[PDB]
């Protein structure tokens, strides 16, 4: 940068999709419990279909 | 609020069967083998009990 000799970084650029300095609560995180419940209930459904 | 509660009497679970394993196979197969001619049913069958 022009005025600050100490401003430098690496080629790596990115972002965390977080809320207020926390770890990111992703979309998959907030859909995962429902997917697990779906899998368990469909397990019951399949075992019912077998019997 | 809890669901409906069933009053289950175990007087017909077959001989030599644990209640746990009996109920476990009833879960799995949806079919529970019972024994109508258990010694505990002798009074009702022979007319000595209600």
Nominal resolution (angstroms): 3.2
Using CA atoms, how far residue A35 sits from A6, A19, A23, A27, B20, in Å, is 48, 24, 22, 12, 31
CA distances from B4 to B1, B7, B10, B11 (A): 9, 10, 19, 22
Task: Assign 3-state DSSP to chain B and report helix, strand, coil percentages, each to 5.
Answer: 40, 0, 60
For residues A24 and B27, what is the distance between their CA atoms, to the nearest angstrom?
Answer: 41
DSSP H helices in chain B: 19-29, 42-46
Which residues 6+ apart lie within 8 Å of A24 measured at CB? A16, A17, A18
Residue contacts between A and B (CB atoms, under 8 Å): 3
What technique determined this structure? cryo-EM
> Which parts of A1-51 fold into alpha helices (H)?
27-50
Query: Distance (Å, rounded) from C-alpha A26 to C-alpha A48?
Result: 34
Calculate how close chain A gets to B20, using CA atoms only, in Å: 20
Helix (H) or strand (E) holding A8: none
């Amino acid at each position: 940068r022009l005025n600050n000799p100490s401003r430098c970084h690496f080629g790596i650029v990115g972002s965390i999709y977080n809320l207020n300095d926390s770890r990111p609560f992703s979309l998959v995180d907030m859909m995962k419990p429902y997917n697990y419940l779906y899998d368990a209930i469909h397990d019951r459904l399949n075992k019912a279909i077998a019997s | 609020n809890w669901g409906s509660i069933l009053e289950l009497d175990l007087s017909k679970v077959p001989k030599g069967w644990d209640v746990g394993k009996w109920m476990y196979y009833a879960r799995v197969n949806h079919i529970a083998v019972i024994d109508s001619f258990k010694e505990g049913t002798i009074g009702a069958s022979t007319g000595k009990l209600a």
